[PDB]
Amino acid sequence: KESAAAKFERQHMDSGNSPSSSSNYCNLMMCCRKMTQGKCKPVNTFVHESLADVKAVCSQKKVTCKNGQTNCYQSKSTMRITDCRETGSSKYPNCAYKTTQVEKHIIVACGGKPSVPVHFDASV
Amino acid sequence: KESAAAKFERQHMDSGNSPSSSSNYCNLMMCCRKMTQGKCKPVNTFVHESLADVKAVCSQKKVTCKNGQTNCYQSKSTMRITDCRETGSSKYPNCAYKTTQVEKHIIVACGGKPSVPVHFDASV
Ligand SMILES: Nc1ncnc2c1ncn2[C@@H]1O[C@H](COP(=O)(O)O[C@@H]2[C@H](O)[C@@H](CO)O[C@H]2n2ccc(=O)[nH]c2=O)[C@@H](O)[C@H]1O
């Protein structure tokens, strides 16, 4: 069982000078979206365009994936994204990330029927 | 078993215009701290002072809790906190919170041995 004390720290403590700061986006999102469980995911990109714009990439420019697979597609237009990269000081389970906001073309792998994004490959 | 498609949405989609806006502190925090599972927790306060400064409240002014319990203590000093209150639009699984930052005295319930904070009761 989680102790009542640890449970209070989880639910009410966030000690620090400016916790609502932009630079904390990846830290909280990586945590919210469950990519800090069991291990820290080193690299993850979030996309801020509509789901419909991202699903459409699966119909755009076909490119080879970094890992040599051939189901990747590059976007025609540049998208608003955020890059979450694990920092130097990061150590499970104190997962820490640098937050980088950029606008770039994305490459996704697509799969299933109907074909939708199943993997973020890179940005250019 | 999570589909590859739903997984992609969970891991990379954060559609919106200002995703790292301070006003999103509560939506991210409430998700990270696991208070948006099963139901949306309606009220929840985060304290930005250090843990020792909060643990110390358990040795300050003893006061009655709002539910009639007698193990509540009120900080001697005001503290930096953030109130997260569910908005009218909020409906699980689409929980949404207003973030409000104030400086107020807190009232916690303390328990165990040593006696530490186990519940957040109110701020004044
Ligand atoms: N061609 C493919 N088809 C289907 N699934 C694939 C393919 N290539 C990789 N995958 C899988 O997709 C799964 C999900 O991974 P993702 O969330 O996309 O993770 C990305 C990538 O797999 C991982 C390792 O490099 O980092 C992320 N990543 C990488 C670079 C980047 O700029 N941004 C980003 O999010 C991984 O298990 C991987 O095995």
Ligand SMILES: Nc1ncnc2c1ncn2[C@@H]1O[C@H](COP(=O)(O)O[C@@H]2[C@H](O)[C@@H](CO)O[C@H]2n2ccc(=O)[nH]c2=O)[C@@H](O)[C@H]1O
């Ligand atoms: N005196 C007490 N001793 C021990 N546990 C208690 C006591 N009073 C309530 N509890 C329990 O404390 C547990 C944890 O609750 P909390 O995380 O503090 O939640 C607070 C409160 O219980 C919940 C319901 O109102 O909202 C929060 N809350 C309320 C007001 C506020 O300003 N801020 C805030 O975080 C609850 O399960 C409750 O049963």
